[PDB]
Design a protein around this ligand. Sequence first.
Ligand SMILES: Nc1ncnc2c1ncn2[C@@H]1O[C@H](COP(=O)(O)OP(=O)(O)O)[C@@H](O)[C@H]1O
Ligand SMILES: Nc1ncnc2c1ncn2[C@@H]1O[C@H](COP(=O)(O)OP(=O)(O)O)[C@@H](O)[C@H]1O
Ligand SMILES: [Mg+2]
Ligand SMILES: [Mg+2]
Lengths: 535, 126, 528, 52
Amino acid sequence: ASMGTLAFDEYGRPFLIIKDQDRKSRLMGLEALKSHIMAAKAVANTMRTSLGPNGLDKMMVDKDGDVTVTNDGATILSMMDVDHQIAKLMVELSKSQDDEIGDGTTGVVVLAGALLEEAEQLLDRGIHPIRIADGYEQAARVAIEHLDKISDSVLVDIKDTEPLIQTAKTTLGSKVVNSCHRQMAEIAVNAVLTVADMERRDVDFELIKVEGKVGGRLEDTKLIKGVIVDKDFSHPQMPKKVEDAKIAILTCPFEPPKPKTKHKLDVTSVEDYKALQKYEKEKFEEMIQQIKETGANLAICQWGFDDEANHLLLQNNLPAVRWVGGPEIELIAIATGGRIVPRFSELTAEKLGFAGLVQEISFGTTKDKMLVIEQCKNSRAVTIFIRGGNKMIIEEAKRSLHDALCVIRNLIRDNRVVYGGGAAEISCALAVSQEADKCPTLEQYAMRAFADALEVIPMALSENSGMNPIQTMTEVRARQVKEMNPALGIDCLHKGTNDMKQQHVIETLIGKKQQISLATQMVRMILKIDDIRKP
Amino acid sequence: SVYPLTFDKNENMAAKKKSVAMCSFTNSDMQILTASGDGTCALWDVESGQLLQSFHGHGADVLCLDLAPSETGNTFVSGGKAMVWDMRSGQCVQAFETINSVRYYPSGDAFASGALYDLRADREVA
Amino acid sequence: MMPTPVILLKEGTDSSQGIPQLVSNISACQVIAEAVRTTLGPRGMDKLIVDGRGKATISNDGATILKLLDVVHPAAKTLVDIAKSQDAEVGDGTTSVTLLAAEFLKQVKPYVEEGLHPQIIIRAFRTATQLAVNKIKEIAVTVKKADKVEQRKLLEKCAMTALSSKLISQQKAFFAKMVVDAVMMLDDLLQLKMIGIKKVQGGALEDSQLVAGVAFKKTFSYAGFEMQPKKYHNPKIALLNVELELKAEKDNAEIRVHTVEDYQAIVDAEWNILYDKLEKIHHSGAKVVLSKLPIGDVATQYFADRDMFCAGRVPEEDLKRTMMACGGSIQTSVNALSADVLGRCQVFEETQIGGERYNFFTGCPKAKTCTFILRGGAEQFMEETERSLHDAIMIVRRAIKNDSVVAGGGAIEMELSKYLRDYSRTIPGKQQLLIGAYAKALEIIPRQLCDNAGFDATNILNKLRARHAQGGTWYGVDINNEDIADNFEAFVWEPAMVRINALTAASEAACLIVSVDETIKNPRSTVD
Amino acid sequence: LLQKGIHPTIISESFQKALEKGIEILTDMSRPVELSDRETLLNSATTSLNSK
Ligand SMILES: Nc1ncnc2c1ncn2[C@@H]1O[C@H](COP(=O)(O)OP(=O)(O)O)[C@@H](O)[C@H]1O
Ligand SMILES: Nc1ncnc2c1ncn2[C@@H]1O[C@H](COP(=O)(O)OP(=O)(O)O)[C@@H](O)[C@H]1O
Ligand SMILES: [Mg+2]
Ligand SMILES: [Mg+2]
């Protein structure tokens, strides 16, 4: 069962095949499958308590002692220090679900664990694991087709954001920001709709800037249709607020020019020294006057500048900020509608950005100042500024808002939704059940195991809500069978009705399909592994 | 590195090594740069002998730091996290977080930190 | 032995000779073959190997598994070497070679234990292998019509057969059609570097796509990149090998001026050099600019102001594929950017694939290259998908070279075994036993298939032997129905070269192993 | 059963009921035997020794 082969020859002579073979272990056959299945079951059972509105958070501590309180399954699995290879496969599955969809990173783990748990008892009865994988693939295809059948379309137009707000609220319900639920959903929807290519094209998340500052309250989080900069005006005596600002974006430091090539300027006489001093002074005055000529009310640089330029900028009533980062320079240029100018001689009036208000923001007794640029004409970049009572809820709000943005992006890509709360899982399990009866006997066990594994999500939701899992799930399934209504789910919030149509529990069809597909493929890959050769 | 007990020299016109330590020679050889285990960098004027200004911005001790390609009055990448300062303002103008040692790329637009960050994009490039 | 005050060889030298040494060699070869036994057939299984660094590799490919094992037995390394040889020359059959070699050695082990001279066994192997290769060339089915539809169908069937043992066997028809489409667009040399393999995490297997063009990931865009439009409808592409940055004119260059006017002139001259390069690029009419060397922020903003697209630090092979697809030329100088050296594609677009941004060059009508974008839920998932697609690609390329096929599922080997047994029954008798052992050894692959499928190997083998003896050439193991079937009519097709190379390499390995009688191991130097 | 949300006391009582029913079924399938019937004794002994 371990250590591999060890015979030392049938003649007594040394028998060495693999380098350092006496310190290596090996698993063969069904024992490897059982070990992998129980490892995946442990991971899935750890994750399953953080599913749904009543799910509980996990407190992750890294090797440096930093504490992360989170409900995001992908984050939990990423920060979990695992050594078993199947656990690493579960972590990679969560990361893949996060990358492709951004929501449902916990459902995939629970579904895969349930699938492997059913496959275990299927293997115990003498079925080849490849046959189990084939049955799982067939059932997954049936479930995906049924999901497409029962899918419903929503309007993505900006004139009516109610379905989008409902979907964002459904995504945010399980997170800690459900206190500010509607505000958070509204700002997520507005942020995604503001920065997007309307012709069902992609959403560039680099245009969405998410910043979090401690202090204030979580309800103080707001969406700014501009840029939040973590800088302030260079000279302390310049005005702290500019209105109707004509903004000049520059990537050249306000310093005398220097060639990139190795250069030596030789001063050979007193006249040369005087000429050099005059050249320096005139260069400073000339760059300041060139900036002032275009009519700019405010100048933003990237590489900082020295005292002479600072005092000339203050003297000419030109507020300015230095050392603005490259991404922030790009965001400011996009939002204000102005071009990026590489040197003063190329600065004109038409390249000036326009902002209705540029202000400096204080944050209480903290000495920290941050710049805000807003009231742009047609700002194509937004900033989500998150406040909270501690940094940990700020990080959690950041990842929850990222989940909401990803969900609205998925709705942008495809506008078909399926009602959650376990209704989709129950309907898919039923459809797999009918499709199994028509199928010949041998694949029936695999299909019914797939259906039972699909049934874990409503049972997990019921258990997290304190309700009896089996009884509630059976009652809801019977109600779904009786009247043709695939929108009946688990009343996690105890609103009094099991219809997710009225409860507005809405999920993207793409997310459900991707969950089912990824879980099935990972389960097949794990089922096909029969040897481990750890050192 | 400690210089000899008396430098064993007689009127070399450069025996004024100073280095009172009450480090790295900056390119404009008029200032000296000291970082201690407390995590705070110090600027001293070698001529006057006065502490120009400090750089309290590193929670962890600054094991290594590197200078600008030239005098440049700025840059000062310091590796505790990689932080870039400006002596014209005394603030962490640019910070990075993703330290064995930090070496500044001679081109001026990047720096390598120790088993590479780009200053024009605030992101790792290599 | 005796102390021998001054010993002959260095102290610590280990020597083994005689029958026990060769028997131990055979046992080591058996041990190596046991490590890949369960990876053969549609019912095969994957293996997980963890190295010292803790990185796990999951593979169904025999050559990869053998390479990962740190084999140190000198006789056992021959199996790994022949697996590598089979992978290099053919690309498929890396498990069959090792199984055949080990089975040959196992079958001849009883004769070795009786004191039979190794040269007789070597001659018997050589004769049997020559006869088997001649029989394969004789009975291989080929079509002398050069029909495009028939050729494409044959290529697709060969790809499906090569793919119906991997984790992507469920989508084997889809992936085989993709592979055949990719291979048919290579021009004359079928260079593997002309087929790009991109792996993007997330998404299902069916989400993977083949780009009739070139696609690569976004490469560290500078500031001002987001103002560049991300879609063009008839762009002209300027493939360059040029650093579009403000930089020193040369490494050893030095400027010596003694006037502020000359200082300003030098600064403006550097700026004018950069702007002249950019203007020469712009006047060429190109809308998409790809460079092998970095493109700076100044150039990025310059191109953004002109509604152009720039992408620096593009990998060299991606630029080569872009040249082969769009149809331009990589320019190290921008002085002559004529229309001849400019690429052209119908649609260029930047989209998001699973959290990563990719640049797509689609609509190329004269493309001679491809790009696979593989989607999967794990790193090793995508790696093993790539390995399976590589196996299929080698199979399709070899089929392009020569469209000669034989039925799989062990049918060809059962036919060869019957032929060799019939031949051996008509020779004096010292070689008869060895050739019969060779023929019996050829039955390992159908037996291994039945064992992996959980079948009854003895009954299936008896039925196959009876069917081949009483008439029928392409009857092999039917995995789905747990019986035997005409694998040629079931489209279980393999190129004849796969089995030819497998038999040749296995016979050579067996002869080399048998030919050795003594092993000497000098003591390690600098053990540290 | 426990994972479905069943208290491990309903399971015990249900198992007791199932055991009683199974005892009834096994008694139903049983056949009377007399010690004079040597063939049945030999068959029982051979069945016992079959697995050894
Ligand atoms: N208001 C609700 N009522 C019932 N079920 C809900 C509600 N909100 C979410 N759920 C269910 O909770 C499950 C888990 O969702 P969530 O924890 O937000 O993300 P993840 O899918 O990553 O765990 C979903 O499958 C969804 O069906
Ligand atoms: N559909 C099929 N039915 C029966 N046998 C098959 C089928 N497809 C492939 N095989 C068998 O699988 C063997 C090759 O297994 P595989 O692992 O794919 O490649 P390798 O030869 O490298 O092991 C071939 O000998 C072939 O006869
Ligand atoms: Mg969710
Ligand atoms: Mg193969």
